Amino acid sequence: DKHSDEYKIRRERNNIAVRKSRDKAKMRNLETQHKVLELTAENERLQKKVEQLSRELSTLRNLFKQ
Amino acid sequence: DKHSDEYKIRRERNNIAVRKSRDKAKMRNLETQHKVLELTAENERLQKKVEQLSRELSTLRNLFKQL
Amino acid sequence: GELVRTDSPNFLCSVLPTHWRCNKTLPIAFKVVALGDVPDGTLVTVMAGNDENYSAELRNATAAMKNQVARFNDLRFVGRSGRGKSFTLTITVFTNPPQVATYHRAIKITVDGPREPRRH
DNA sequence: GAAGATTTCCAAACTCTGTGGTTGCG
DNA sequence: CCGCAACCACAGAGTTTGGAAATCTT
């Protein structure tokens, strides 16, 4: 019977668990998105660092020559 | 009412609509993880060539600086 | 998105559609930019004016400044502007002392927002 | 197998555009 | 007369929220 003390407790127990778990899911979902942007940031920053050094090497080359 | 002909039909379409959405979000989420790897790959790749251009310009500067 | 000069020469802000549907989200994210230097965390508020409507109810009309910009999340226009009339909003930077900026005849708020001409 | 965690199913409550009925006003 | 620009309602597709079951994982 979908309405027998035993079932009822077991039910509520599970609910208690699906709540907790859906929560975890969302949290993990946010972390990701966060992680994303956080990369894109670092990713963009590194691209500069390359540009900076690429030019800097084109200078110590054109410099060794002259 | 819960036995209306309208009811079931409206109800049954909403269900379809939901399947749609659940699928959609579940999908965006994945695409995101993908979008994260994508970039992690790029940071690794970027990081390697960065430590390169640093050694190469620190080496060229070494012959120069110390003669 | 693309920005525009305000009544003030110290702050720029997002461009807005000429006419949009009340309580509907906008095509872009509304953001205010300070050319001078402004302390992150500086609260900024937006009010919407009009001959008709003194001040129209808004949603998400407040935002904290950050890195010289106060991006707004789904800012929204509840009150309407009246046929043919546009809203002239008031940006108000909360610093010491509070600073004011104005974008004249900025956006038009109708109950339908832009619609496709009726096929009659 | 047993218990908790995760997923899939749906139902219900709302939110997001659209379209149709009307109306003054050029 | 007609079409435009506004209002009001108000369908109907989307979404988010939450309790049941199924499915998994431990």
Side-chain angles (χ1 to χ4, degrees), chain A residues 1-65, chain B residues 1-5 7-67, chain C:
Chain A
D1 182 67
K2 180 186 175 177
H3 297 296
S4 318
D5 264 308
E6 186 50 44
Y7 162 103
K8 299 162 77 177
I9 30 178
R10 180 185 303 175
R11 182 71 277 157
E12 171 56 306
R13 184 174 298 206
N14 163 275
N15 313 332
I16 228 174
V18 77
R19 308 185 188 194
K20 167 185 173 179
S21 176
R22 268 158 179 164
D23 179 62
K24 188 188 311 313
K26 245 307 176 62
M27 231 84 311
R28 285 183 285 194
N29 300 309
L30 293 181
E31 170 55 5
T32 289
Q33 301 175 62
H34 161 191
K35 195 106 298 183
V36 177
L37 316 179
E38 178 211 302
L39 282 212
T40 338
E42 190 49 48
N43 201 68
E44 194 209 313
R45 187 193 79 68
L46 273 204
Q47 195 58 62
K48 278 176 59 67
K49 185 71 174 304
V50 164
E51 278 294 359
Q52 191 69 183
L53 297 180
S54 298
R55 263 165 281 194
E56 270 188 39
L57 256 187
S58 174
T59 273
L60 288 197
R61 271 200 177 183
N62 193 304
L63 241 300
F64 242 47
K65 307 158 191 172
Chain B
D1 152 292
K2 282 187 178 181
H3 310 200
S4 175
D5 233 48
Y7 185 116
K8 187 53 190 171
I9 311 173
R10 275 141 58 187
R11 162 50 57 188
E12 199 65 11
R13 274 175 176 164
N14 182 196
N15 290 329
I16 320 174
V18 161
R19 277 189 275 290
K20 156 166 292 185
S21 180
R22 173 54 65 181
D23 299 311
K24 171 160 298 175
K26 180 197 283 186
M27 174 147 243
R28 297 194 196 306
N29 168 292
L30 308 184
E31 172 201 296
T32 291
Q33 272 154 50
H34 203 295
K35 194 62 142 64
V36 149
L37 300 205
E38 207 118 64
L39 297 189
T40 266
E42 191 49 27
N43 265 218
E44 207 49 69
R45 192 280 276 179
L46 251 263
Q47 173 51 55
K48 190 57 177 289
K49 157 159 288 192
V50 175
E51 61 174 296
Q52 151 180 48
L53 291 193
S54 73
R55 195 50 25 56
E56 190 183 306
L57 189 145
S58 190
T59 295
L60 170 169
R61 185 170 294 177
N62 260 40
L63 310 181
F64 181 82
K65 67 205 288 285
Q66 197 180 189
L67 302 183
Chain C
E2 186 186 308
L3 341 71
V4 52
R5 289 184 37 57
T6 63
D7 118 301
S8 171
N10 299 299
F11 306 75
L12 296 180
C13 79
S14 304
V15 199
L16 284 189
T18 322
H19 161 215
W20 203 247
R21 179 188 203 167
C22 47
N23 217 333
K24 165 159 170 175
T25 310
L26 323 100
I28 59 64
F30 189 29
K31 25 181 169 296
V32 171
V33 180
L35 296 186
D37 188 289
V38 195
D40 304 46
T42 297
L43 296 185
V44 173
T45 74
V46 188
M47 295 171 271
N50 180 298
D51 309 325
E52 172 64 359
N53 213 313
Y54 174 84
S55 180
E57 172 171 45
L58 299 191
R59 296 182 54 224
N60 294 20
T62 307
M65 179 68 77
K66 197 296 168 187
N67 176 56
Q68 312 316 279
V69 178
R71 185 161 299 82
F72 273 107
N73 76 313
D74 184 44
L75 168 61
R76 282 184 151 180
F77 295 81
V78 176
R80 296 68 124 303
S81 45
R83 189 187 189 98
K85 299 175 179 182
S86 306
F87 272 175
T88 306
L89 60 175
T90 296
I91 304 188
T92 313
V93 211
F94 285 359
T95 63
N96 261 325
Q99 304 188 61
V100 158
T102 302
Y103 188 158
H104 305 283
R105 284 169 52 64
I107 197 178
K108 193 175 70 179
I109 301 305
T110 60
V111 172
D112 288 355
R115 292 189 50 162
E116 165 60 9
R118 208 76 69 83
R119 285 188 306 176
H120 189 296

